[PDB]
């Protein structure tokens, strides 16, 4: 494909019921991402306390819906970055269940 976000937002079913307005894909190993749940505890954007920030910078891609994008013909702008991720963790085992932010 010629647009990573267009391809991935579609194949991961993120354009099925609507165009998900924003989404981040993380390119690190599952183990490295799961490990973040034991790293820096920070407040979640929603005020909950179960968010964790990665000590290391991680390779990520941000996907953001374009202005002309209109469901069901979704369209995205792709932006690559290397940033610390912030994820919300829950459960036993304690694992990532939401992507909160990158910083």
């Amino acid at each position: 494909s010629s647009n990573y976000c267009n391809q991935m937002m579609k194949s991961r079913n993120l354009t099925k019921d609507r165009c998900k307005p924003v989404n981040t894909f993380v390119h690190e190993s599952l183990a490295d991402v799961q490990a973040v749940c034991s790293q820096k505890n920070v407040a979640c954007k929603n005020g909950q306390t179960n968010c964790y920030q990665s000590y290391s910078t991680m390779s990520i891609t941000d996907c953001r819906e374009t202005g002309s994008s209109k469901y069901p013909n979704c369209a995205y702008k792709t932006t690559q970055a290397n940033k610390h991720i912030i994820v919300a963790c829950e459960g036993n085992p304690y694992v990532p269940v939401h992507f909160d932010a990158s910083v």
Binding site: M8, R12, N13, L14, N23, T24, F25, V26, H27, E28, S29, L30, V33, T61, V87, E90, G91, V95, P96, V97, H98, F99
Partner: peptide, 15 residues
């Protein structure tokens, strides 16, 4: 069916 952990992986993981 899909667990919260599996949904996170589908939405956010691309190794």
């Amino acid at each position: 069916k899909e667990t919260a952990a599996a949904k996170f992986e589908r939405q956010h993981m691309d190794s």
